[PDB]
Amino acid sequence: AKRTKKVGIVGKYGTRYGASLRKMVKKIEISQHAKYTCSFCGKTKMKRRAVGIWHCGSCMKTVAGGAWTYNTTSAVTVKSAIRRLKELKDQ
Amino acid sequence: QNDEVAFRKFKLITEDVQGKNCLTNFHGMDLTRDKMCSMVKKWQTMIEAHVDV
């Protein structure tokens, strides 16, 4: 059955730290402990090892990423901009 | 120009001066305000294009 109405993963914190802080950390913890689909082997086994470090259990590929998500939106936009500037630089 | 149209202007920035003569080179052109405003009319479409070249 459903065990909690809204706290979900931050039910481990009990009544402590405040509702807004628990709500704030809930999404970050979900993204932190989620298992991502590896873009090298295709298996959903890419998970965080340390802060910013993401490892895949299948192909043993370690990727440097975000603290809580596998990649940040900032880095994705940066990669797109770098690709655009590289293809502009040469002709 | 001796007998060209008058609604066209030129920028002609100065690069070098020798003696009492300032020497200019092309810097840009533009139409006059009245010509541009008179060209735009209703019940018609205008097409605007820009290109770096």
Added chain:
Amino acid sequence: GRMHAPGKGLSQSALPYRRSVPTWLKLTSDDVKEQIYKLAKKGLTPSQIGVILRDSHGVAQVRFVTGNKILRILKSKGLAPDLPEDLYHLIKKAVAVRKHLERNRKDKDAKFRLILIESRIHRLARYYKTKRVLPPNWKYESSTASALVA
């Protein structure tokens, strides 16, 4: 009026009052059946088969010249598609919209169109399961539908 659009278009096809095969049509029933079988082996849906037959081979209605409809002929020979054509195309459209949506999260218009498409899919599937064309436990799953089409 359209099912999911506020459009009241009238563009249809006016089938002629003459049900007789035209005299210049030399094609016999077996020849048309062979053409349908070949075009089905090429992978054409019955709508495309009818379009090709009308455009190129000069047959007006397959039902008029053979006595049977195209899907009837395919099902009789046993090479009719497992999914109905329009249901297949609706699932294909929904899969395409979902593929576009998982990259463009802000496309709320695409979400609205996806909702409309899935409503159409479920209504068509309910009709087909009532007619027992589909298995009675047939269900459209948005996650696993992508392998069923294309």
Added chain:
Amino acid sequence: RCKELGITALHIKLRATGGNRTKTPGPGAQSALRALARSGMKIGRIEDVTPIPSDSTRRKGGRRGRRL
């Protein structure tokens, strides 16, 4: 002042307030230009140089305007 500094002709560039604000030149344009003409100064080209935004920031006064 121009005559005592040896200038005999003048190109004219009329300007209004421009920008997001009004585009009609003030009451002084006509009299200033006519006085320049009647003072012996020669007149050359005339052109409007009012700043026209391709589109501007929000004009002051609120959405209900200047209530008077």
Added chain:
Amino acid sequence: TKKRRNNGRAKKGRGHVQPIRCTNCARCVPKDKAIKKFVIRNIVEAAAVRDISEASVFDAYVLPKLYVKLHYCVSCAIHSKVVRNRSREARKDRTPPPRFRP
């Protein structure tokens, strides 16, 4: 009572029309509701054309026109007398007043 069939604006098959600022008071007026006047006035007064022509360095100089489009809220349009109240029947005609060429 519904005074006008079109509600005093040109919006027919639209939901929203972008607003414009009144040229007199800077009021946010819908673009299809505002009174528009496109004045094409000589850049010099008709009293001063002769003096400018005399003081021109050119012989056949064509004086510039001034192209200004004006937008008014109906408050400023009525107060500035460009538009006037009309009788109930006379409100229904859309033909602009004649130019008075002669």
Added chain:
Amino acid sequence: PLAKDLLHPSPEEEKRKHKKKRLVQSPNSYFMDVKCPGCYKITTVFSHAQTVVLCVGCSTVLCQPTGGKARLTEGCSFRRKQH
């Protein structure tokens, strides 16, 4: 007119009216014989064809599908089928 004869319309207004709104539905399309120059065989082509029709003996296009009617390639002869 209070006494329009709905039973016997003349062919002019019968042809101008919409295909569905006629007294009896009649398609506006037809079938045509198409002669490609340099080829002897004859292809029966729909007047409103939605596909590119090709000669089986020559790699030549006969019609280009458009919004309403397939535009025949130039140099190609065509006639009607039984009105």
Added chain:
Amino acid sequence: KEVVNKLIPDSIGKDIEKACQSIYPLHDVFVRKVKMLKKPKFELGKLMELHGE
């Protein structure tokens, strides 16, 4: 040099108008504006041969 001299009568706009007649007629076709974005180092000989011979 021969860009500036050919935009002096705006032959570019005239051939643009001539080229666009098969799509939709155009009447007031001009190069409304050109601006100078980058310049090559100001070689004095080039400026001199633009002014002189």
Added chain:
Amino acid sequence: KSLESINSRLQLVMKSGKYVLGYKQTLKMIRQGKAKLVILANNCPALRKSEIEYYAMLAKTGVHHYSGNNIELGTACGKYYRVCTLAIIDPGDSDIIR
């Protein structure tokens, strides 16, 4: 238009032609000289891709680098598992022109 065409043709290769799914079976079919087309996901390891290309050159068979990945190639094949390499023995649908 190329991606939708290859997806439709791959769907029609299934249910109508002889194929084989996977790396080991693809190599087996290639060295038996009966694989007429090899399709590779761009997710393929570069060493595996290069080796399969060398095998294809030796056997004179075509290689198509699929514009998806092993998950999407598996979906395009109609399967619920990832396929990274596959070989068509005979299409039955003119994916491979005579």
Added chain:
Amino acid sequence: MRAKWRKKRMRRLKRKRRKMRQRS
């Protein structure tokens, strides 16, 4: 009053009532 300002006055009064009831 203007109906909008009666609405605003009523909203202020409703907030005050909610506060007083919560105080118990």
Added chain:
RNA sequence: GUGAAAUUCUUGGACCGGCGCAAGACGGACCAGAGCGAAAGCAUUUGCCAAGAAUGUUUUCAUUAAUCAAGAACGAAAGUCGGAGGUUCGAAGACGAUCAGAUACCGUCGUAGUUCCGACCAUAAACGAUGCCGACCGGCGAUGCGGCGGCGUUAUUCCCAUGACCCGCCGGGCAGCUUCCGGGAAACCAAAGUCUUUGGGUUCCGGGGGGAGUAUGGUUGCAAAGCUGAAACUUAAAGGAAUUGACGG
């Protein structure tokens, strides 16, 4: 800067003119009783991505449909939360004026906000103050899209295609003018007609004015608030459309 002023900036060069740099907003004029979208809404170029109405169809399925409690998606602006950004404008606030007073209208400055991304909220005169689907019932000239048919002009080219115009027809739209179709209390409406000659299908919803969209209960929401929602008591009128008169800074 204003009706006039004043706060304010100014021999420290303020304002003005010129040349550049930086930033963030904003996409004029073209722009229309024009288009698209379920609405909210949507206007710089170019590319990509899916989507769509209308039209054409001698293509296919063959009743799969219309409206819909519960439920679901979207939902202007303002407001809330987190992160960027903050040019202008500008709630609050400060000051200068006006004034009998002036906590305002006017002016100067200026916070939140207005900008982007992510998450809430679910309200507008969210209007056509006008449910959806279907059928019938006047005329006319236009407009946008698609298709069809025709003198001709034009673009290149040698001709037809194909564009740009001209004249018509068909289908779907935004509308407009006229009408003793008919309706209505009338204003007005070709729908607000086809209604005592009352019945095409269906959904939501009103029962004199206040109290009151209030109290209470329940529920959603971080909050603001949203949804459901009385009663006591009070009142003989409140309202709608039109006419005459009076009055109008």
